[PDB]
Amino acid sequence: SNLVLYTLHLSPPCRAVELTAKALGLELEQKTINLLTGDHLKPEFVKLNPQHTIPVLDDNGTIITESHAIMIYLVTKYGKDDSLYPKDPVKQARVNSALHFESGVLFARMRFIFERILFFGKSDIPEDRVEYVQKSYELLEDTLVDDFVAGPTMTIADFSCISTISSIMGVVPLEQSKHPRIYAWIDRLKQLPYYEEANGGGGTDLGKFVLAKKEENAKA
Amino acid sequence: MSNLVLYTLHLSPPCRAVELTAKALGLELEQKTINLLTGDHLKPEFVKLNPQHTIPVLDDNGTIITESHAIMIYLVTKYGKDDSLYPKDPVKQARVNSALHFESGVLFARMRFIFERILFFGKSDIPEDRVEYVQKSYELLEDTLVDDFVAGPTMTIADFSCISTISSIMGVVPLEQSKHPRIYAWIDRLKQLPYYEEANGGGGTDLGKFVLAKKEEN
């Protein structure tokens, strides 16, 4: 049996994995979990994941929650080589640090911005949400001393960061004169044959959505 | 070779996640103290060491790893006597890497949303928006503890990340006991380590106090 992803293409951690599949030549069976309609709060998916988050991987019995774990596991099982996730401990620790930086800083700050708008009826981006996100951009620009977030070679840490950054930048302006490293980096990832499809359209579209969703919360 | 060097601060929850990890592995760190409240992490030497200006930072014979979870993974991988703290099996590994990522993306992050503005920006409330946010993370962590330890039948570094965070934030945003029996039963398992209070408990308990004391900047 083929790998199944419970997923939503608007979802950033969803797109992280989709990029990885693509990079691995893996064909995912997508099953939609519409968070807007509470698909994830339904009892059958609460059984798959008590955190009721997406994506969820199902690989013929094995269920893996959490984008960064599913990405590790996909490379470990299916990679024909380890470029996307180094076996060398020292090299793997730089990937790990950038994976946790993405979880703990970039996506966490994005969520602190998006979640109250898309789910709690909110119509503002508080100024402190803004500073946390603008600080997360600078932290990323300083992490890019190499061409890719965790070295000179592209890793799953790059998919993880791009899926987030490409969502939040269409909502909290990423000034280009101040972040040339981030932009030169986005440019690299856009050169990927599968970039528009696995990520760039859902990032762009989630940004626009959050903005529509927030023009919409101001009214009724 | 050289000893393990951690740039650290015992009050910092991710530092203590690494302390618990060293202690469990029989390792012995040489703490170099990086005191945030007097700006020691923004010192030019350290900023060149760690671009993101955070701690802990591991110096392992000139290999520099920043970020506590990557540190705890490195140290288990390179110096474990077994994969007890971080399974090598892909599936049980994934369960642990999911708890670790829940840990940075949820538990730690929402504690930083509360704590940082109080300790660093002069603020003196905890809005019901923050409270609700940390309580929803108590709940996700309770939902997750379907076995004795966070990532299953056996204690991993994932349990070190969670407890180091949960022990700092309980004393500020109450973790109510009737609601979270699994968490409490689980805190109880952690306190049953002889090195628990030393490497973690006390600093977490005193991170709570320092926030409440510093809040009183009304």
Short mmCIF file of C-alpha atoms in Angstrom, two decimals:
data_model
loop_
_atom_site.label_atom_id
_atom_site.label_comp_id
_atom_site.label_asym_id
_atom_site.label_seq_id
_atom_site.Cartn_x
_atom_site.Cartn_y
_atom_site.Cartn_z
CA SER A 1 0.00 0.00 0.00
CA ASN A 2 0.84 3.61 -1.07
CA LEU A 3 1.53 6.31 1.60
CA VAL A 4 -1.45 8.40 2.76
CA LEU A 5 -1.33 11.93 3.91
CA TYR A 6 -4.17 13.47 5.85
CA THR A 7 -3.80 16.99 4.72
CA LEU A 8 -4.96 20.40 3.53
CA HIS A 9 -2.98 22.18 0.91
CA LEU A 10 -3.43 25.59 2.58
CA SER A 11 -1.70 24.14 5.65
CA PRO A 12 2.00 25.04 6.06
CA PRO A 13 3.18 21.91 7.79
CA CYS A 14 1.14 20.09 5.16
CA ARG A 15 3.14 21.67 2.30
CA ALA A 16 6.46 20.92 4.10
CA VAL A 17 5.81 17.20 3.59
CA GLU A 18 4.47 17.59 0.04
CA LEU A 19 7.79 19.29 -0.90
CA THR A 20 9.61 16.32 0.72
CA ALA A 21 7.53 13.72 -1.14
CA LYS A 22 8.27 15.55 -4.28
CA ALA A 23 12.04 15.70 -3.47
CA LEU A 24 11.92 11.92 -2.78
CA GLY A 25 9.90 10.95 -5.89
CA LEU A 26 7.11 9.71 -3.62
CA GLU A 27 3.50 9.71 -4.62
CA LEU A 28 1.13 10.62 -1.76
CA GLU A 29 -2.52 9.76 -1.51
CA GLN A 30 -4.07 13.00 -0.17
CA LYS A 31 -7.16 12.77 2.01
CA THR A 32 -8.49 16.16 2.86
CA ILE A 33 -9.04 17.28 6.45
CA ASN A 34 -10.81 20.65 6.18
CA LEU A 35 -9.97 22.43 9.44
CA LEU A 36 -12.41 25.33 8.57
CA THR A 37 -15.31 22.76 8.91
CA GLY A 38 -13.82 20.83 11.93
CA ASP A 39 -12.82 17.63 10.02
CA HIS A 40 -9.98 17.29 12.58
CA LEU A 41 -12.19 17.46 15.55
CA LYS A 42 -14.21 14.50 14.23
CA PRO A 43 -13.86 11.31 16.45
CA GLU A 44 -12.14 9.17 13.78
CA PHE A 45 -9.31 11.68 13.29
CA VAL A 46 -9.13 12.34 16.97
CA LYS A 47 -8.30 8.64 17.07
CA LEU A 48 -5.39 9.08 14.62
CA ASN A 49 -4.08 12.16 16.40
CA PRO A 50 -5.07 13.36 19.90
CA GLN A 51 -3.55 16.69 18.93
CA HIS A 52 -6.04 16.86 16.08
CA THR A 53 -3.43 18.46 13.78
CA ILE A 54 -2.41 17.83 10.21
CA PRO A 55 -0.54 16.47 8.43
CA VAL A 56 -0.89 12.89 9.46
CA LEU A 57 1.02 10.14 7.74
CA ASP A 58 -0.38 6.62 7.35
CA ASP A 59 2.13 4.18 5.85
CA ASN A 60 0.33 0.76 5.86
CA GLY A 61 -0.31 0.61 9.52
CA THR A 62 2.23 3.18 10.80
CA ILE A 63 0.76 6.53 11.78
CA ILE A 64 3.06 9.53 12.17
CA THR A 65 1.79 12.86 13.32
CA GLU A 66 3.76 16.16 13.08
CA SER A 67 5.34 17.44 9.86
CA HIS A 68 8.99 17.31 10.98
CA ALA A 69 8.80 13.74 12.17
CA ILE A 70 6.98 12.60 8.94
CA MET A 71 9.69 14.37 6.95
CA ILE A 72 12.56 12.67 8.94
CA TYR A 73 10.82 9.29 8.51
CA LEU A 74 10.14 9.69 4.82
CA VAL A 75 13.86 10.51 4.13
CA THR A 76 15.02 7.72 6.47
CA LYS A 77 12.83 5.12 4.85
CA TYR A 78 12.73 6.19 1.28
CA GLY A 79 15.63 8.34 0.40
CA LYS A 80 17.95 6.83 -2.13
CA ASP A 81 20.65 9.01 -0.36
CA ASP A 82 20.73 11.17 2.73
CA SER A 83 21.18 14.69 1.31
CA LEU A 84 17.76 15.76 2.59
CA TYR A 85 18.54 14.52 6.08
CA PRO A 86 22.22 13.78 6.95
CA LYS A 87 23.13 10.66 8.87
CA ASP A 88 26.42 12.28 10.08
CA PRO A 89 25.58 13.47 13.72
CA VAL A 90 27.25 16.86 13.33
CA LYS A 91 25.61 17.49 10.02
CA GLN A 92 22.30 16.13 11.33
CA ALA A 93 22.41 18.49 14.32
CA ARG A 94 22.49 21.49 12.09
CA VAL A 95 19.45 20.24 10.29
CA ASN A 96 17.77 19.47 13.66
CA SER A 97 18.47 22.93 15.01
CA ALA A 98 16.91 24.59 11.95
CA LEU A 99 13.91 22.13 12.22
CA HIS A 100 13.30 23.18 15.75
CA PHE A 101 13.90 26.81 14.99
CA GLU A 102 11.19 26.48 12.36
CA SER A 103 8.80 24.67 14.86
CA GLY A 104 9.53 26.92 17.80
CA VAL A 105 10.06 30.29 16.21
CA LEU A 106 8.86 30.76 12.66
CA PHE A 107 5.70 28.58 12.66
CA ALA A 108 4.83 29.23 16.25
CA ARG A 109 4.85 33.01 15.57
CA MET A 110 2.87 32.57 12.38
CA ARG A 111 0.23 30.57 14.27
CA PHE A 112 0.13 33.23 17.01
CA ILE A 113 -0.87 35.54 14.08
CA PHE A 114 -3.11 33.31 11.91
CA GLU A 115 -4.98 31.18 14.40
CA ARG A 116 -6.95 33.90 16.16
CA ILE A 117 -7.92 35.29 12.73
CA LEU A 118 -8.93 32.09 11.04
CA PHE A 119 -10.58 30.42 14.04
CA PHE A 120 -11.25 32.95 16.85
CA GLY A 121 -13.05 35.64 14.76
CA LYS A 122 -10.31 38.25 15.08
CA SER A 123 -9.87 41.20 12.84
CA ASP A 124 -6.52 42.68 13.92
CA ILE A 125 -2.82 41.74 13.71
CA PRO A 126 -1.65 43.09 17.08
CA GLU A 127 1.60 45.08 16.99
CA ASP A 128 3.26 42.45 19.24
CA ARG A 129 2.39 39.63 16.81
CA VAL A 130 4.01 41.78 14.13
CA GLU A 131 7.27 42.29 16.14
CA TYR A 132 7.53 38.57 16.97
CA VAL A 133 7.13 37.78 13.22
CA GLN A 134 9.51 40.60 12.06
CA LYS A 135 12.02 39.24 14.75
CA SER A 136 11.56 35.75 13.34
CA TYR A 137 12.44 37.04 9.84
CA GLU A 138 15.75 38.56 11.18
CA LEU A 139 16.55 35.38 13.02
CA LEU A 140 16.21 33.52 9.74
CA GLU A 141 18.24 36.00 7.69
CA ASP A 142 21.07 35.53 10.34
CA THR A 143 20.77 31.75 10.09
CA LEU A 144 21.33 31.90 6.32
CA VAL A 145 25.21 32.22 6.38
CA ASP A 146 25.08 29.42 3.82
CA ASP A 147 22.90 28.99 0.72
CA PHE A 148 20.30 26.87 2.64
CA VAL A 149 19.09 27.04 6.17
CA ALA A 150 21.26 24.15 7.58
CA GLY A 151 24.23 24.22 5.19
CA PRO A 152 25.48 24.39 1.56
CA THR A 153 23.10 21.42 0.72
CA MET A 154 19.26 21.69 0.64
CA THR A 155 17.47 19.80 3.42
CA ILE A 156 13.97 19.11 4.74
CA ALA A 157 14.73 22.05 7.01
CA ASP A 158 14.44 24.26 3.89
CA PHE A 159 10.94 22.90 2.93
CA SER A 160 9.86 23.37 6.52
CA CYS A 161 11.04 27.03 6.56
CA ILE A 162 9.77 27.89 3.05
CA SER A 163 6.27 26.50 3.73
CA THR A 164 5.97 28.86 6.70
CA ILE A 165 7.75 31.88 5.31
CA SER A 166 5.75 31.84 2.07
CA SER A 167 2.53 31.95 4.01
CA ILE A 168 3.28 34.71 6.57
CA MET A 169 5.12 37.08 4.15
CA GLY A 170 1.88 37.89 2.22
CA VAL A 171 0.45 39.04 5.58
CA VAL A 172 3.41 40.56 7.54
CA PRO A 173 5.55 42.36 4.96
CA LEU A 174 9.04 41.01 4.52
CA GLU A 175 11.05 44.04 3.50
CA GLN A 176 13.45 43.03 0.77
CA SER A 177 16.19 45.72 1.36
CA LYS A 178 16.52 44.38 4.89
CA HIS A 179 16.39 40.66 4.11
CA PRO A 180 18.45 40.00 0.96
CA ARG A 181 19.54 36.51 2.19
CA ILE A 182 15.93 35.29 2.63
CA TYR A 183 15.01 36.52 -0.87
CA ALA A 184 18.03 34.98 -2.56
CA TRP A 185 17.07 31.78 -0.69
CA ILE A 186 13.37 31.83 -1.85
CA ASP A 187 14.76 32.29 -5.36
CA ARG A 188 16.81 29.09 -5.01
CA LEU A 189 13.70 27.08 -3.82
CA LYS A 190 11.56 28.48 -6.63
CA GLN A 191 13.86 26.97 -9.11
CA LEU A 192 12.62 23.53 -8.05
CA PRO A 193 10.49 21.86 -10.84
CA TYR A 194 7.84 20.93 -8.22
CA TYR A 195 7.89 24.24 -6.23
CA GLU A 196 4.70 25.97 -7.51
CA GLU A 197 2.58 22.80 -7.04
CA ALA A 198 3.84 21.49 -3.72
CA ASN A 199 4.10 24.85 -1.99
CA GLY A 200 4.12 28.25 -3.68
CA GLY A 201 0.41 28.39 -4.56
CA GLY A 202 -0.85 27.24 -1.12
CA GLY A 203 1.52 29.74 0.68
CA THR A 204 0.36 32.59 -1.54
CA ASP A 205 -3.26 31.46 -1.27
CA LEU A 206 -3.18 31.09 2.62
CA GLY A 207 -1.76 34.63 2.94
CA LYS A 208 -4.56 36.07 0.79
CA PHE A 209 -7.06 33.99 2.77
CA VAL A 210 -5.93 35.22 6.17
CA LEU A 211 -6.26 38.73 4.76
CA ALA A 212 -9.78 38.08 3.30
CA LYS A 213 -10.69 36.22 6.50
CA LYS A 214 -9.72 39.28 8.51
CA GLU A 215 -11.50 41.94 6.26
CA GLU A 216 -14.40 39.53 6.96
CA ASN A 217 -14.10 39.44 10.76
CA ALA A 218 -14.33 43.21 10.96
CA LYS A 219 -17.94 43.21 9.68
CA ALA A 220 -20.25 40.51 11.04
CA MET B 1 39.26 14.78 24.25
CA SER B 2 37.89 18.07 25.68
CA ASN B 3 35.01 18.16 28.13
CA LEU B 4 31.50 19.06 27.00
CA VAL B 5 30.93 22.84 27.19
CA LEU B 6 27.40 24.19 27.49
CA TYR B 7 26.72 27.95 27.39
CA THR B 8 23.72 28.00 29.65
CA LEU B 9 21.61 29.49 32.46
CA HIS B 10 19.89 27.25 34.91
CA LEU B 11 16.71 29.41 34.98
CA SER B 12 16.35 28.81 31.13
CA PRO B 13 13.97 25.80 30.51
CA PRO B 14 15.79 24.51 27.38
CA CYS B 15 19.10 24.54 29.23
CA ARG B 16 17.58 22.26 31.90
CA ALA B 17 16.20 19.95 29.19
CA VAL B 18 19.88 19.52 28.17
CA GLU B 19 20.94 19.20 31.87
CA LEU B 20 18.50 16.38 32.48
CA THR B 21 19.85 14.76 29.30
CA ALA B 22 23.56 15.00 30.38
CA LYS B 23 22.64 13.69 33.87
CA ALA B 24 20.70 10.68 32.45
CA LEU B 25 23.60 9.86 30.10
CA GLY B 26 26.26 10.08 32.87
CA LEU B 27 27.82 13.07 31.20
CA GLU B 28 29.42 16.01 32.82
CA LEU B 29 29.06 19.53 31.46
CA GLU B 30 31.19 22.51 31.96
CA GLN B 31 28.60 25.31 32.39
CA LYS B 32 29.67 28.70 31.12
CA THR B 33 26.94 31.08 32.35
CA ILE B 34 25.13 33.32 29.88
CA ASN B 35 22.99 35.61 31.85
CA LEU B 36 20.18 37.02 29.74
CA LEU B 37 18.95 39.65 32.23
CA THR B 38 22.29 41.45 31.99
CA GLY B 39 22.56 40.99 28.20
CA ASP B 40 25.47 38.48 28.11
CA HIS B 41 23.97 36.67 24.99
CA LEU B 42 24.10 39.95 22.98
CA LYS B 43 27.83 40.19 23.74
CA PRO B 44 29.76 40.33 20.47
CA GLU B 45 31.69 36.99 21.06
CA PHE B 46 28.52 35.03 21.74
CA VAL B 47 26.63 36.68 18.84
CA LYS B 48 29.31 35.35 16.58
CA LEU B 49 29.06 31.99 18.31
CA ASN B 50 25.25 31.89 18.12
CA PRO B 51 23.66 34.05 15.33
CA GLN B 52 20.17 33.51 16.94
CA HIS B 53 21.53 34.68 20.34
CA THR B 54 19.87 31.91 22.35
CA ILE B 55 21.02 29.26 24.84
CA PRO B 56 21.88 26.52 25.41
CA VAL B 57 24.84 26.30 23.21
CA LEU B 58 26.93 23.11 23.01
CA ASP B 59 30.63 23.32 22.37
CA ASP B 60 31.75 19.77 21.69
CA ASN B 61 35.47 19.95 20.92
CA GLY B 62 34.75 22.83 18.56
CA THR B 63 31.56 21.45 17.08
CA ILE B 64 28.98 24.12 18.03
CA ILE B 65 25.34 23.14 18.34
CA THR B 66 22.75 25.67 19.27
CA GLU B 67 19.15 24.63 20.03
CA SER B 68 18.42 22.33 22.91
CA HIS B 69 16.56 19.59 21.06
CA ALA B 70 19.32 19.12 18.48
CA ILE B 71 21.77 19.06 21.40
CA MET B 72 19.86 16.40 23.30
CA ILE B 73 19.66 14.34 19.98
CA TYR B 74 23.44 14.66 19.25
CA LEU B 75 24.33 13.72 22.86
CA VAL B 76 22.09 10.62 22.89
CA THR B 77 23.29 9.54 19.42
CA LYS B 78 27.01 10.06 20.03
CA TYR B 79 27.27 9.17 23.68
CA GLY B 80 24.32 6.92 24.55
CA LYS B 81 25.11 3.33 25.78
CA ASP B 82 21.70 2.38 24.30
CA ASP B 83 18.85 4.07 22.21
CA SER B 84 16.77 4.26 25.34
CA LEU B 85 16.58 8.07 25.27
CA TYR B 86 16.10 8.41 21.62
CA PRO B 87 14.93 5.19 19.81
CA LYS B 88 16.74 4.21 16.56
CA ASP B 89 13.70 2.35 15.17
CA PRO B 90 12.08 4.72 12.53
CA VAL B 91 8.55 4.40 14.05
CA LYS B 92 9.43 4.84 17.70
CA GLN B 93 11.90 7.49 16.68
CA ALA B 94 9.06 9.35 14.86
CA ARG B 95 6.86 9.26 17.99
CA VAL B 96 9.71 10.95 19.87
CA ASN B 97 10.47 13.47 17.13
CA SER B 98 6.71 14.36 17.18
CA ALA B 99 6.73 15.01 20.97
CA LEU B 100 9.93 17.07 20.58
CA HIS B 101 8.39 19.23 17.86
CA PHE B 102 5.04 19.55 19.90
CA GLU B 103 7.46 20.67 22.50
CA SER B 104 9.13 23.52 20.70
CA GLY B 105 6.11 24.50 18.57
CA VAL B 106 3.50 24.48 21.41
CA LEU B 107 4.70 24.11 24.97
CA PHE B 108 7.81 26.19 24.86
CA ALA B 109 6.57 28.78 22.36
CA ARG B 110 3.45 29.69 24.42
CA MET B 111 5.45 29.82 27.52
CA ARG B 112 7.77 32.25 25.76
CA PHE B 113 4.62 34.28 24.62
CA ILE B 114 3.74 34.74 28.28
CA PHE B 115 7.16 34.98 29.97
CA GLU B 116 9.19 37.07 27.50
CA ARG B 117 6.97 40.17 27.45
CA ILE B 118 6.96 40.21 31.32
CA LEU B 119 10.82 39.59 31.75
CA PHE B 120 12.02 41.67 28.85
CA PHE B 121 9.42 44.23 27.66
CA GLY B 122 8.16 45.73 30.92
CA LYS B 123 4.71 44.15 30.83
CA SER B 124 2.65 43.29 33.92
CA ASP B 125 -0.39 41.34 32.80
CA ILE B 126 -1.09 37.87 31.53
CA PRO B 127 -4.05 38.49 29.17
CA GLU B 128 -6.81 35.83 29.08
CA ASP B 129 -5.59 35.33 25.46
CA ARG B 130 -2.22 33.94 26.78
CA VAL B 131 -3.75 31.88 29.65
CA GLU B 132 -6.21 30.17 27.31
CA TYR B 133 -3.24 29.51 24.89
CA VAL B 134 -1.09 27.74 27.61
CA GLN B 135 -4.13 25.91 28.96
CA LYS B 136 -4.93 24.63 25.50
CA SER B 137 -1.23 23.31 25.46
CA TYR B 138 -1.70 21.61 28.97
CA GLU B 139 -4.61 19.88 27.35
CA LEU B 140 -2.76 18.83 24.22
CA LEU B 141 0.02 17.43 26.43
CA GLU B 142 -2.59 15.60 28.58
CA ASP B 143 -4.19 14.21 25.34
CA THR B 144 -0.69 13.02 24.30
CA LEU B 145 0.11 11.13 27.55
CA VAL B 146 -1.70 7.94 26.68
CA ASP B 147 1.31 6.02 27.99
CA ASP B 148 3.42 6.71 31.18
CA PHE B 149 5.91 8.90 29.33
CA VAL B 150 5.29 11.45 26.66
CA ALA B 151 6.48 9.48 23.73
CA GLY B 152 5.48 6.08 25.08
CA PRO B 153 6.15 3.34 27.63
CA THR B 154 9.65 4.61 28.34
CA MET B 155 11.21 8.01 29.22
CA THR B 156 12.97 9.80 26.32
CA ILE B 157 14.66 13.28 25.89
CA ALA B 158 11.16 14.29 24.74
CA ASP B 159 10.10 13.96 28.42
CA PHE B 160 13.07 16.18 29.39
CA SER B 161 11.91 18.96 26.92
CA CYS B 162 8.30 18.89 28.13
CA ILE B 163 9.01 18.80 31.87
CA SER B 164 11.58 21.54 31.73
CA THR B 165 8.90 23.79 30.18
CA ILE B 166 5.90 22.51 32.16
CA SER B 167 7.80 22.99 35.46
CA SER B 168 8.48 26.69 34.76
CA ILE B 169 5.05 27.60 33.55
CA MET B 170 2.88 25.71 36.12
CA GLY B 171 3.76 28.22 38.82
CA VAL B 172 2.53 31.18 36.71
CA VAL B 173 -0.40 29.69 34.71
CA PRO B 174 -1.80 27.09 37.10
CA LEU B 175 -1.86 23.59 35.85
CA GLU B 176 -5.05 22.39 37.49
CA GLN B 177 -4.83 19.01 38.95
CA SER B 178 -8.39 17.68 38.57
CA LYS B 179 -8.19 18.39 34.80
CA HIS B 180 -4.73 16.89 34.05
CA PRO B 181 -4.24 13.61 36.04
CA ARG B 182 -1.93 12.10 33.40
CA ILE B 183 0.34 15.14 33.52
CA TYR B 184 0.48 15.09 37.34
CA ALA B 185 1.08 11.30 37.44
CA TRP B 186 3.79 11.95 34.91
CA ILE B 187 5.40 14.90 36.75
CA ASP B 188 5.34 12.37 39.67
CA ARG B 189 7.43 9.86 37.51
CA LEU B 190 9.97 12.55 36.76
CA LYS B 191 10.43 13.59 40.35
CA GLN B 192 11.37 9.94 40.97
CA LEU B 193 14.77 10.56 39.30
CA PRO B 194 17.51 11.31 41.79
CA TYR B 195 18.99 14.06 39.52
CA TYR B 196 15.55 15.59 38.76
CA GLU B 197 15.48 18.40 41.38
CA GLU B 198 19.06 19.33 40.67
CA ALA B 199 19.11 19.44 36.88
CA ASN B 200 15.53 20.61 36.57
CA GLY B 201 12.95 21.00 39.22
CA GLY B 202 14.36 23.83 41.30
CA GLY B 203 15.23 26.10 38.30
CA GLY B 204 11.76 25.60 36.86
CA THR B 205 10.14 26.40 40.20
CA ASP B 206 12.44 29.51 40.42
CA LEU B 207 11.71 30.54 36.75
CA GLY B 208 8.03 30.62 37.86
CA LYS B 209 8.91 32.89 40.90
CA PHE B 210 11.05 35.27 38.98
CA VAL B 211 8.17 35.89 36.52
CA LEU B 212 5.62 36.60 39.28
CA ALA B 213 8.20 38.75 41.12
CA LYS B 214 9.09 40.69 37.96
CA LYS B 215 5.38 41.07 36.95
CA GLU B 216 5.02 43.23 40.02
CA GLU B 217 6.28 46.09 37.77
CA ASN B 218 2.94 47.82 38.10
#
